[PDB]
Amino acid sequence: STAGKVIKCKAAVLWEEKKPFSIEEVEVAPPKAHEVRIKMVATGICRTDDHVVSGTLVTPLPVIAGHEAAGIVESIGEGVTTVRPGDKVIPLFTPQCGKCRVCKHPEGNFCLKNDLSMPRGTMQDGTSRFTCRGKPIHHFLGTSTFSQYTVVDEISVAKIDAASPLEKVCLIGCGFSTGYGSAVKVAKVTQGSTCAVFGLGGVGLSVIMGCKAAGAARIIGVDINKDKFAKAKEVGATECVNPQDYKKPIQEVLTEMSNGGVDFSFEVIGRLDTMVTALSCCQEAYGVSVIVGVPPDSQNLSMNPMLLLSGRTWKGAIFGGFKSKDSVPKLVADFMAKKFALDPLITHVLPFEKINEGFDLLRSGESIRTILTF
């Protein structure tokens, strides 16, 4: 009854930076060739979406944000072969076109069709499927999940298990997979190692989950909000430290605690200074540091390259290094088989209409993941 037709629905439109989202009616065009229109079931609030509001992450406005979500296919455009109406799906903020040099590389996952490096805020064809008050509205990372319906390119959606609980598995679309993969796939944490995790939000807790799964003997959580420590220990941290408690810089503290530096460190905040601190606290000859946090737009850090010359490895990754369309269904299957848990990340649940309250909870430090239900 809606196939081929414009759908009018509610969405959370961001008209300008540093303002509440506006819950109001938008028009969602039907999918074109190789596009998929999705009815949203649940979406999480990730710090990246707040970065859009704050101007930390620059993408064209006005915009429908949201990128960590799950829903049910409402209709498919001409030529779609990988999903069907009625399928449960997770939108992929990093596409997997399967044809570019990165998709063909055994390690790479940052597909060249991404909308991150040179943000356009469009579908792959350079146009928008959203109208609001008669005005075109930008997409976000080819997902735009803060809406009752969205349209994504086929390379930006994965079919998942038909029995999946969408109010939980939406976290596999961003925060869980990012943190878990950063530990198990990017860093390749080893049994018996010592790890340090900077930032104990949804993504940092997922890093801890991955470090424990990889068998780390010590996992040191680092956060300036000590209210985050109890859940960090629940999911695997052996000891938590607040940098504000110490007179010395925390990388000196962590080097002392690890008897000369940690094996693996992770920056999961998004600050230039903590990226450098995290690199410095890994052991100078064989340590590995992974950047996960998003830096403020266009800003450069400063560092002494002797930190690298002694032997450190420094790297970063999007989405935990996972090839998105191959990996998301497998991660869902693994969740259904109880191989990892998502409940520890979910601290609050709200209806989509209370999106602004959900962002207030994030900004206040009270929440990890709030899940919004449509």
Ligand X SMILES: NC(=O)C1=CN([C@@H]2O[C@H](COP(=O)(O)OP(=O)(O)OC[C@H]3O[C@@H](n4cnc5c(N)ncnc54)[C@H](O)[C@@H]3O)[C@@H](O)[C@H]2O)C=CC1
Which residues are near ligand CXF by CB under 6 A?
46, 48, 57, 67, 93, 116, 174, 294, 318
Residue 122: CB minimum distance to Zn ion, A = 17
Q: Which helix (H) or strand (E) holds 197?
A: strand 194-198
Residue 320: CB minimum distance to a second copy, A = 11
Query: CB under 8 Å to 226, separation ≥6 — which residues?
Result: 240, 242
Number of residues that bind a second copy (CB under 8 A): 43
Contact by Cβ (8 Å): 151, 129: yes
Residue 173: CB minimum distance to Zn ion, A = 8
Residue 295 found at the interface with a second copy (CB under 8 A):
yes
CA–CA separation, 262 and 219 (whole Å)? 10
191 binds, options ligand X, a second copy, Zn ion, none, Cβ within 5 to 8 A by partner type:
none
> Can you give the binding site for ligand X, defined by CB under 6 A?
46-48, 51, 174-175, 178, 198-204, 222-225, 228, 243, 268-271, 274, 292-294, 309, 318-319
1 binds, options a second copy, ligand CXF, Zn ion, none, Cβ within 5 to 8 A by partner type:
none
Give exposure, 324-340, as e/b (b: 16+ Cβ within 10 Å). bbebbbebbeebeeeeb
The one-character DSSP state at 310 is T
Of 221 and 320, the one with the shorter C-beta distance to a second copy is 320
Q: Which stretch binds Zn ion (CB under 5 A): 55-63, 111-119, 126-134, 260-268?
A: 111-119
CA–CA separation, 98 and 57 (whole Å)? 27
Give the orientation angle of helix 355-363 with respect to helix 47-54, to 10 degrees.
90
Length of the chain as a residue count: 374
Give exposure, 140-174, as e/b (b: 16+ Cβ within 10 Å). bbbbbbbbbbbbbbbbbbbbbeeebbbbbbbbbbb
Query: CB under 8 Å to 309, separation ≥6 — which residues?
Result: none
Position of minimal CB gap to ligand CXF:
48
Q: By CB under 8 A, what part of segment 21-50 binds a second copy?
A: none
Q: By CB under 8 A, what part of segment 269-288 binds a second copy?
A: 272, 275, 283-286
Position of minimal CB gap to ligand X:
201
Residues that bind a second copy (CB under 8 A): 101-102, 105, 107-110, 112, 116-117, 259-260, 272, 275, 283-286, 291-292, 294-295, 298-306, 308-318, 321
